[PDB]
């Protein structure tokens, strides 16, 4: 429960014991992929990629159950009572349950409709019904994992959390070559290798773990605004792939290459926002919302430093390395420009996503929705449109009019984030 240095530590020392432990967790997910494809190695059962996206579906709920998980323990155990601490977890659990069953009962009757507005099935498509009940079937135990995560993440106990990332790896790098060779189970096998080691990781947790619509409202509020912000992410994607491929096809294969670089180093500002957000929930509880204040700002230090030193290397690398992932030169040329003209607003997420976080941490959700809003939508949609159509400019309007709302919703953060009346009386309301 206790982790030390919380309340009167350095937030420096406190925030990366943290947010390491959480980022080799991050780094681990990676493994997953790797191994797959490795020993997928050794057109038909391809797909299996139709259903990717139901998949990360899946894991944005699992995402949202974690914060609001996250969120509302650690504020509980802020203000010692660990009392409404496991009322918490019954209710996160039961939250869970009832998540897994309206997604896999809706998921099924619809299934037909859903698995038509995804792939067509000229080819592939008894494959595709067949993982998409697969797929199905995860479900409680990905809503479980969830429930855990956040279990973990809200008593600050994230070696745990790290432990069971490695535990999992390894469990699938096993299990992968096993399935393949000692089963003959193939494509499937891998698949099932990959289930059985997030199973691995669930059965960790319980055995560590091993030694009033008040509350139903304050966790749903949080998790689904988590998933709200999820899915006003995924739409500003969408957005600006429309109006990149409407303009010029080779931009699209552009940012098909680049994005697995743009998100890798997003990551660390990731893990620092998971650490960020136990600490501000854990000292908001205590009453202290100076120190809260000064968590979120210490992490846009540590955030902005790194993610900024990565978009540097990221820009003066890619030049020489993107000639080098395709033979189409206007496709590493506009991936080149890209980077960068882009890759400096990156540092710039920290500032208006962690402070999404905090207002998660002391469950006042509207305004992380709000700026997330203000960074993916508001800004961005009409200036792309008057720098890249009515202004003439093309893809260049879309590079620099995509960027304006990150800084938009800096300035936000940057005026929000500070002792008021209003904060300071939210905390007295709340505790
Ligand atoms: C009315 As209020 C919760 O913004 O102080
Ligand atoms: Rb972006």
Redesign the pocket.
Known sequence: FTVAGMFDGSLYKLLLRMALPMFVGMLTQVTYAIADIFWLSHGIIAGVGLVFPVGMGLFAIANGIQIGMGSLLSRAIGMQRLDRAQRILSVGIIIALFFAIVITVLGYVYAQPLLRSLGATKSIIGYATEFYYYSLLTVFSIMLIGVMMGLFQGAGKIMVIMKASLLGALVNIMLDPIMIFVFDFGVKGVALASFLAQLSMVAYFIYTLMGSWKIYREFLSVGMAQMLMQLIIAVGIVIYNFFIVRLDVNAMAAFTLTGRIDYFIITPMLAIATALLTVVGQNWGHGNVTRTLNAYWAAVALAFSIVLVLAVMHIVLAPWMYPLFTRVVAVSDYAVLQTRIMALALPFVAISLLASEYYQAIGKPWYSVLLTLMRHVFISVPVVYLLAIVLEMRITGVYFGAMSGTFVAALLAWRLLRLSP?LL??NQ?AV
Request: without cysteine; glycine residues 0%.
């Open positions: 209003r009386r939210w309301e």
